[PDB]
Design a protein around this ligand. Structure first.
Ligand SMILES: O=S(=O)(O)c1cccc2cccc(Nc3ccccc3)c12
Ligand SMILES: O=S(=O)(O)c1cccc2cccc(Nc3ccccc3)c12
Ligand SMILES: O=S(=O)(O)c1cccc2cccc(Nc3ccccc3)c12
Ligand SMILES: O=S(=O)(O)c1cccc2cccc(Nc3ccccc3)c12
Length: 159
């Protein structure tokens, strides 16, 4: 209050159900698949796949960042809908309390329409860097481009 937020709207030739599974439900695992150079493991530490499930993504040894943990706060997996929060790990940078992601997908002929909102939460009475915004939008977005391309040339996967 006030918080920094991106609002993006995208579309890819990939059906929502395949994207929501690769970029949400099994993200922790798909990150170690598209970027084996920068991530060692991604796991669930308690939970199912439902609100309160916590994941852990661990960086490779020669990376500056250390690990991340996210909590699943709202899933409606049928509707392609997720709100999830980066709460812990060396990743955070000092003026931001958490990062809060809200995803909804929808089908669109042969593919997808995502609307994503990423809200950057400063810690008690601090300010949020705008460089981090641009870094957080480039790192998620390339990863999506790697995944898209990948779900594109193997229709089999998550299909
Ligand atoms: O990493 S990605 O292709 O992005 C990927 C994205 C989403 C789901 C995946 C499932 C299996 C293997 C993958 N990759 C992979 C690639 C070559 C060999 C083994 C696995 C998946
Ligand atoms: O927008 S991104 O920054 O990659 C992004 C960031 C965070 C979570 C996302 C979840 C699903 C799809 C995304 N992108 C997307 C791309 C194409 C079509 C629909 C969604 C997500
Ligand atoms: O992209 S950033 O991290 O923002 C970045 C920002 C500024 C300078 C960078 C130099 C090399 C690699 C980067 N990225 C990178 C990240 C992980 C693995 C390898 C390279 C740099
Ligand atoms: O963005 S994510 O989608 O989690 C992501 C996806 C793929 C690779 C990433 C590497 C480093 C940091 C990330 N996140 C991040 C968090 C805050 C600021 C900048 C980057 C990465």
């Amino acid at each position: 209050m006030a918080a920094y937020t991106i609002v993006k709207e995208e579309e890819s030739p990939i059906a929502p159900h395949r994207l929501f599974k690769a970029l949400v439900l099994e993200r922790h695992q798909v990150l170690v698949k598209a970027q084996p150079h920068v991530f060692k493991s991604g796991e669930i530490i308690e939970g199912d796949g439902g609100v309160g499930t916590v994941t852990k993504i661990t960086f490779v040894d020669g990376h500056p960042l250390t690990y991340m943990l996210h909590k699943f706060d709202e899933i409606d997996a049928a509707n392609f809908y997720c709100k999830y929060t980066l709460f812990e790990g060396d990743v955070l940078r000092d003026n931001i309390e958490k990062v809060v992601y809200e995803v909804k997908l929808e089908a669109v002929g042969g593919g997808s329409k995502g609307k994503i909102t990423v809200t950057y939460h400063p810690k008690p009475g601090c300010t949020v860097n705008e460089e981090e915004v641009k870094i957080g939008e480039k790192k998620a977005y390339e990863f999506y481009k790697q995944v898209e391309e990948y779900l594109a040339a193997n229709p089999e996967v998550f299909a």
